[PDB]
Amino acid sequence: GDLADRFAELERRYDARLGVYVPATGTTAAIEYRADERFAFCSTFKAPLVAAVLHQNPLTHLDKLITYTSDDIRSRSPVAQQHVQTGMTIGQLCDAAIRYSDGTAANLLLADLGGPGGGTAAFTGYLRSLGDTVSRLDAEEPELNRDPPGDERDTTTPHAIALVLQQLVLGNALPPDKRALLTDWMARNTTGAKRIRAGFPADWKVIDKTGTGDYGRANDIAVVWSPTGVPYVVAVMSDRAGGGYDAEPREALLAEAATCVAGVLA
């Protein structure tokens, strides 16, 4: 119908593949467009990664110091760059991973979660513990952003990652104290202003984690709250694989998809 046609026009205009999922609520039907097609996580995985590390350990574990060297920085790492000599705490790594999408921070958290070699498997296992049987993480940073189109490695679906974020932020996957850390870090993020946030009116609260990658990949996952406090979860994923590995991502595509959703939820 109308919404499907609107989303299709976005795909034509941006020369992109778009995926959208918004779970049903008691008064709204699910919004679904390519919701069960796989799309690369890119940095969206960092949100559930932090949740996994929070869940697996006591609060005092956030103060554990992790050391590393400049040879460990193999991805865009705006925070970890500055702390090679000192190390960073698990807590500082979580902050960096969410708020700066720091790649080395995410790799170090993976290693904390699953050991050397076992991180991506352990991360995927955490998603399994949340009832996500579809998503998979296979490589670390930066390779996870760079898989060829069609490859199932390092992919989720709008549907799957929406339900994950829903459990983490709106459900009881984490105890409230841990849930609030995750939520707060997402609230203070420095990369999502032009994505789902840009599709919702200013009196709606939005917290999000972005992802960006090769093949014009641009994703955003969010929880939003209406002016009266009614929550919804919004996943928007995109790629422009037709343009090749260096295709330009289009944040505006996500903002527009979000505007369509906001129009329905208003």
Numbering used by the authors: 27 to 57, 59 to 83, 86 to 145, 145A, 145B, 145C, 145D, 146 to 238, ...
Copy text verbatim from the article accompanying this structure deposition.
pmcAntibiotic resistance mediated by β-lactamase-producing bacteria has become one of the major threats to global health. This phenomenon has substantially reduced the efficacy of β-lactam drugs, which are the most commonly prescribed antibiotics worldwide. β-Lactamases (EC.3.5.2.6) are a group of enzymes that can hydrolyze the amide bond of the β-lactam ring, thus making the antibiotics inactive. One such residue, at position 105 (standard Ambler numbering), is suggested to play an important role in substrate discrimination of class A enzymes. Interestingly, BlaC, the β-lactamase from Mycobacterium tuberculosis, possesses Ile at this position, sparking the question about the evolutionary preference for this amino acid. Mutation of Ile105 to Arg in the β-lactamase BlaC simultaneously enhances activity for carbenicillin and the ability to evade clavulanic acid inhibition.
Comparison between BlaC I105R and wild-type structures indicates a minor repositioning of the active site residues with one important difference. The newly introduced arginine at position 105 adopts a conformation that differs from the isoleucine in the WT, moved away from the active site. Consequently, the access to the active site is broadened. In principle, this would allow for easier accommodation of both substrate and inhibitor molecules, but it can also lead to an augmented dissociation rate of the initial Michaelis complex in case interactions between active residues and substrate or inhibitor have weakened. Furthermore, we investigated whether any structural changes in I105R would be detectable in solution using nuclear magnetic resonance (NMR) spectroscopy. In agreement with the observation from the crystal structure, only the 102 to 106 loop, harboring the mutation site, experienced large chemical shift perturbations. In line with the observed MIC value, BlaC I105R showed improved activity (kcat/KMapp) for carbenicillin (2.7-fold increase) but impaired hydrolysis of nitrocefin and ampicillin (4- and 3-fold reduction, respectively). The positively charged guanidinium group of the arginine side chain might act as a “fishing pole” in attracting negatively charged carbenicillin molecules through the carboxylate group on the C6 atom. However, even long and charged residues, like Arg, can serve as a viable replacement, as demonstrated in BlaC.
